[PDB]
Amino acid sequence: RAFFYIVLLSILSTGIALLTLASSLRDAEAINIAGSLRMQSYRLGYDLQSGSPQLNAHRQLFQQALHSPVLTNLNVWYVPEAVKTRYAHLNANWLEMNNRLSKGDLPWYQANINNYVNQIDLFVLALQHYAERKMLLVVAISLAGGIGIFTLVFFTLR
Amino acid sequence: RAFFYIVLLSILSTGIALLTLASSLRDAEAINIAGSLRMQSYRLGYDLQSGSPQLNAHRQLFQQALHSPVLTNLNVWYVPEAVKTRYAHLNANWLEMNNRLSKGDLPWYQANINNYVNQIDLFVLALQHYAERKMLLVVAISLAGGIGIFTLVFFTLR
């Protein structure tokens, strides 16, 4: 009975920790790439102002980053609704921004870029928070697991 | 002897995991804020091109983000040399960029911004990688801990 509970605990704690860790091996990547969307968005305005030849390539590059695996992989049952919903919004905002950029519309860009980037900012923040809650969970269960086993062994040994 | 090894293992595994996790509760924040430096850098060029009144505020805002606690806290013995060294570079590059921005020097900006942002990019990538190695470690020890205890209990029970 004593050892059964020690193994059960070791398997549960280790299992949940690894399952959460496995769903977090790309949290940092996501935050980086989501983050970059902000720079790319302002770099587009900078291209539009300097008449850079690179405008169209950056347009498509932003689109590619937006729809990167890591970010598309956020549309899964276990990723909170807030993250998936913010992502979806970004995806809609981009269509307008891109269309505006194709029509050379700097005045609309100047007027909207702050809000536009603020939204990306919120998204990135949600990823940040999400990644922290999960890391916390790992902490709580790794802790409780080491404590539980220490307690089970303390009484059993006694 | 059997239970002594089961507790020792539970304490080691849990200890190292928590110690690594504790040194990673702000990995996501770091990547976000380091990431933002990229956007802020291009937003500065955009201000400089549009003659925005916000130029000076963004200059100082970038400086404040650059020197944020989370990022200054990277200068510690247990953070790899590569991260601390890239950070230091950013800190030097900013002084030139800021001085150039004060003298209204768009031509130098246009010519250097890509390289300048590429460096921030590398920094952010190093933070990303660093955060992943640590998360891996947590995975490896949480795993080995649950396995070790399962094995210790299997033989002891047998």
Side-chain angles (χ1 to χ4, degrees), chain A residues 2-102 104-154 156-157, chain B residues 2-102 104-154 156-157:
Chain A
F3 285 111
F4 164 84
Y5 286 131
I6 289 174
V7 165
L8 182 65
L9 192 54
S10 167
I11 285 176
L12 257 52
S13 65
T14 298
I16 302 171
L18 287 176
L19 211 60
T20 295
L21 283 164
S23 72
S24 283
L25 296 188
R26 287 163 77 94
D27 289 353
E29 176 175 23
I31 296 161
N32 181 1
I33 291 179
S36 63
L37 301 180
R38 302 180 283 194
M39 173 271 289
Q40 295 188 56
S41 294
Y42 265 110
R43 183 170 69 185
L44 289 171
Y46 170 84
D47 293 342
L48 191 63
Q49 292 184 336
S50 59
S52 189
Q54 297 182 283
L55 180 62
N56 293 358
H58 291 151
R59 294 168 58 203
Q60 34 199 199
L61 184 64
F62 175 98
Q63 174 152 308
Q64 169 179 104
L66 185 57
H67 296 138
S68 301
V70 73
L71 289 199
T72 56
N73 288 349
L74 294 173
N75 291 316
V76 172
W77 67 268
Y78 62 72
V79 170
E81 178 272 18
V83 171
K84 290 177 296 209
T85 292
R86 291 192 171 285
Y87 186 48
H89 274 284
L90 295 190
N91 270 305
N93 308 10
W94 164 235
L95 299 186
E96 191 62 48
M97 168 60 78
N98 199 28
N99 181 200
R100 296 282 183 178
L101 294 167
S102 64
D105 201 0
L106 179 52
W108 175 100
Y109 180 97
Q110 284 175 154
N112 285 263
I113 187 48
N114 190 61
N115 175 235
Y116 186 90
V117 176
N118 279 0
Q119 304 311 134
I120 300 160
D121 208 30
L122 285 156
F123 181 63
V124 178
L125 190 58
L127 293 169
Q128 183 196 300
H129 292 342
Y130 175 46
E132 285 163 352
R133 294 184 218 106
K134 289 193 291 171
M135 174 166 288
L136 194 72
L137 184 56
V138 174
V139 164
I141 310 185
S142 288
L143 180 61
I147 280 180
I149 286 177
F150 169 92
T151 296
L152 285 177
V153 167
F154 176 86
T156 303
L157 174 59
Chain B
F3 285 111
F4 164 84
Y5 286 131
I6 289 174
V7 165
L8 182 65
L9 192 54
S10 167
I11 285 176
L12 257 52
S13 65
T14 298
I16 302 171
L18 287 176
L19 211 60
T20 295
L21 283 164
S23 72
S24 283
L25 296 188
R26 287 163 77 94
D27 289 353
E29 176 175 23
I31 296 161
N32 181 1
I33 291 179
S36 63
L37 301 180
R38 302 180 283 194
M39 173 271 289
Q40 295 188 56
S41 294
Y42 265 110
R43 183 170 69 185
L44 289 171
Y46 170 84
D47 293 342
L48 191 63
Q49 292 184 336
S50 59
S52 189
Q54 297 182 283
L55 180 62
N56 293 358
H58 291 151
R59 294 168 58 203
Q60 34 199 199
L61 184 64
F62 175 98
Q63 174 152 308
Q64 169 179 104
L66 185 57
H67 296 138
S68 301
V70 73
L71 289 199
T72 56
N73 288 349
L74 294 173
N75 291 316
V76 172
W77 67 268
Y78 62 72
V79 170
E81 178 272 18
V83 171
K84 290 177 296 209
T85 292
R86 291 192 171 285
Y87 186 48
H89 274 284
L90 295 190
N91 270 305
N93 308 10
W94 164 235
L95 299 186
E96 191 62 48
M97 168 60 78
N98 199 28
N99 181 200
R100 296 282 183 178
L101 294 167
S102 64
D105 201 0
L106 179 52
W108 175 100
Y109 180 97
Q110 284 175 154
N112 285 263
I113 187 48
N114 190 61
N115 175 235
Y116 186 90
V117 176
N118 279 0
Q119 304 311 134
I120 300 160
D121 208 30
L122 285 156
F123 181 63
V124 178
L125 190 58
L127 293 169
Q128 183 196 300
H129 292 342
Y130 175 46
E132 285 163 352
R133 294 184 218 106
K134 289 193 291 171
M135 174 166 288
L136 194 72
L137 184 56
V138 174
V139 164
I141 310 185
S142 288
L143 180 61
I147 280 180
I149 286 177
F150 169 92
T151 296
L152 285 177
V153 167
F154 176 86
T156 303
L157 174 59

